[PDB]
Amino acid sequence: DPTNQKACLSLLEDLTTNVKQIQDSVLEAILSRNAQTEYLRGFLNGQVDKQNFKKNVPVVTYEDIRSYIDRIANGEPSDLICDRPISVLLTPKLIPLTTEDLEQRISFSSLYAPLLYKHIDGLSEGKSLIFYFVTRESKTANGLMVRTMVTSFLKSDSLQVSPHAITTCADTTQSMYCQLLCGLLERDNVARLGAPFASSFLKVIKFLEDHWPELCSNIRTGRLSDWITDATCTSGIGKFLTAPNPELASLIEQECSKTSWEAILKRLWPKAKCIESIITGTMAQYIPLLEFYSGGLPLTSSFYGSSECFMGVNFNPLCKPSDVSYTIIPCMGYFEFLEVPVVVDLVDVKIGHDYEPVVTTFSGLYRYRVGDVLRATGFYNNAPHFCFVGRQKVVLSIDMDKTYEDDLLKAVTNAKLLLEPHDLMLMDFTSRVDSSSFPGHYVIYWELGSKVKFEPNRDVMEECCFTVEESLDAVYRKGRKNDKNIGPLEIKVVKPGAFDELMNFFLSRGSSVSQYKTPRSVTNEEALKILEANVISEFLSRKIPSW
């Protein structure tokens, strides 16, 4: 929060030690400044203490305060919800952001950065090759900016391989190509690789897999592709491309031509010391693929965050992906936790319990529920750990059964092992409820790839079906064995890149390449048309689970 430079910052130690006191001061400030705002005044008539806050300010989801956002979106002053002015709305839910909040988030990334260098060796020797892409932005009925967390961040170079001109290119395909082409030219000075999310990084790699001949023609030739037409991208890359380089292009041609893409990330960027991308929550689905390309590079997730709030860091970057735990940053805002009618302070949180973060914010959110489940796993200093379980919203439900993101993540994780004996792997997956049969049943869509022209093994695929069911909750398995209101589960296999076509579908509906996440459930009849369109084979569970 205050004034840190870039010598040594033991603030990391103060923040994580005076947690109880730093949190009381954050709450004291929000209630004090915002005491005269329509939202906060209505519940507390100028009261500024925690005990009145916990009695009379309700714990809310996004629905409840949408009217306030819509009003500000529609030109009413920021004092409905926020003292300071509202700099942007972020993206279909729109979240108010204030400059001062934005700059606090960025300031924290700077102060956290010396911790990374101590923990992973040689991170300081070179620049990052981390892929961000901006999104087309809007403006309200009045002139309020509407943007993306990534886009908002980016509007603000020393340590990135890619010149700012290029990452800010309006066209994300051209920018990916060009960020790829700069990082190839500068492989010798790349000390890490990344993207915000594991899946976004894999998207880039796939791109490299399908566009590495043209990249390498461009390096030999020394002349750019004319698929890339934006002036910024073209001018911006002149500094990088310069003189023809046949030996490097041959050196790259050598790695991409091989029969396996195993360890390609180590072979292309031999000096990279880690891969930075989020591998928690749904993003654990992509660890097997990432590990396969990593060539033993460590996988590090460091940040847990949201439009609403910047919550926690991984103070243990080099750990098992299966053991990441994020430490709530006590000065980002006032954190409560709803066990899962009991809500609890950051300090009172009990280890091994599942909570949903409930935040109060410097940009107009009061006791706001984030929509995620966390499990308290311990303390970094005096500051609590949590591990990410999943989004807290049911993903599938035929009737009484409720399946959540995590227990479906587990059930697929368990099941996809039975694939791995024939060098086959589950690329991505999603689901829906089929109310068309009587009884209804679950449907999982599996896109298979391989580490190498293959066909699903029918006997294996029906044990994949069974293994999902067997991992689901007692209420499901009882529906199937006893109540007979749940039909045999079904896995549909989809053409490769079916999931990319699902993605592009949601991009043309306002989503962002950088912030995208594959839905583990799909109701949008929109997206079902695509999924069924890419279906090749279907299998059913032939055994009945047990309960």
Ligand X SMILES: Nc1ncnc2c1ncn2[C@@H]1O[C@H](COP(=O)(O)O)[C@@H](O)[C@H]1O
* Binding site per annotation, positions for ATP: 280, 303-308, 326, 372
Q: How many residues bind ligand X (CB under 6 A)?
A: 16
Structure tokens at 535: 């279906």
CA-to-CA separations, 334 to 28, 200, 297, 345, 432, in angstroms, rounded: 10, 30, 36, 9, 36
Least Å from the CB of residue 178 to ligand X: 24
Q: Which stretch binds ligand X (CB under 6 A): 35-43, 203-211, 344-352, 366-374?
A: 366-374
**Nearest distance, CB of residue 314 and ligand X, angstroms:** 8
- Return the residue of 112, 133, 293, 388 that touches ligand X, per CB under 6 A: 388
Q: Report 390-449 residues binding ligand X (CB under 6 A).
A: 391
- Which residues, numbered 123-152, are part of the site for ligand X (CB under 6 A)? 149
Residue 315 found at the interface with ligand X (CB under 6 A): no
Residue 22, interface with ligand X (CB under 6 A)? Answer: no
User: Of 137-145, 173-181, 277-285, 409-417, which segment contacts ligand X by CB under 6 A?
Assistant: 277-285
Nearest partner of 390 among 402, 374, 410, 403, judged by Cα: 374
Q: Does 370 bind ligand X (CB under 6 A)?
A: yes
Burial string for 380-418 (b: 16+ CB within 10 Å, else e) reads bebbbbbbbbbbbeebbbbeebebbbbbbbbbbbebbeb
Which one of the spans 80-88, 186-194, 222-230, 364-372 is the region binding ligand X (CB under 6 A)?
364-372
Residue 197 or 429 having the CB closest to ligand X: 197
Whole-angstrom distance, CA of residue 79 vs CA of residue 95:
15
| CA 115 – CA 12 distance, rounded (Å) | 9
Instruction: Could you list the residues known to form a binding site, using ranges.
Output: 280, 303-308, 310, 326, 372
Which residue in the set 116, 195, 278, 472 belongs to the binding site for ligand X (CB under 6 A)?
Answer: 278
Q: What share of the chain is helix, strand, coil (3-state, %, to 5)?
A: 40, 20, 35
In the complex, the smallest distance separating the C-beta of residue 95 from ligand X, rounded to whole angstroms, is 7
Phi first, then psi: give them for residue 232, nearest 5 degrees.
-60, -55
Q: Quick one: which of 114, 305, 439, 497 contacts ligand X (CB under 6 A)? A: 305
Residue 369: name the closest of 65, 146, 56 by CA.
65
Contacts to ligand X from residues 476-515, by CB under 6 A: 515
- Confirm or reject binding of residue 306 to ligand X (CB under 6 A): yes
Tokens 């243990």, located at residue:
316
Q: Which stretch binds ligand X (CB under 6 A): 77-85, 247-255, 297-305, 537-545?
A: 297-305
Do residues 425 and 412 make contact, with C-beta atoms less than 8 angstroms apart?
A: no
Provide, rounded to whole angstroms, the least separation between the CB of residue 301 and ligand X. Answer: 5
- Asked if residues 334 and 311 have their Cβ atoms less than 8 Å apart, the reply is no
| Spatial separation of the C-alpha atoms in residues 430 and 422, rounded to whole Å | 22
Cα 467 from Cα 71, distance rounded (Å)? 49
Among 98, 301, 363, 534, binds ligand X (CB under 6 A): 301
* CA-wise closest residue to 480 among 418, 542, 415, 411: 542
Length of the chain: 547
Binding-site residues for substrate: 303, 310
By CB under 6 A, is residue 280 in contact with ligand X?
yes
From 264-272, 275-283, 473-481, 533-541, span contacting ligand X (CB under 6 A): 275-283
Nearer to ligand X, 128 or 515 (CB): 515
Residues in contact with ligand X by CB under 6 A are: 149, 278, 280-281, 301, 303-307, 370-372, 388, 391, 515
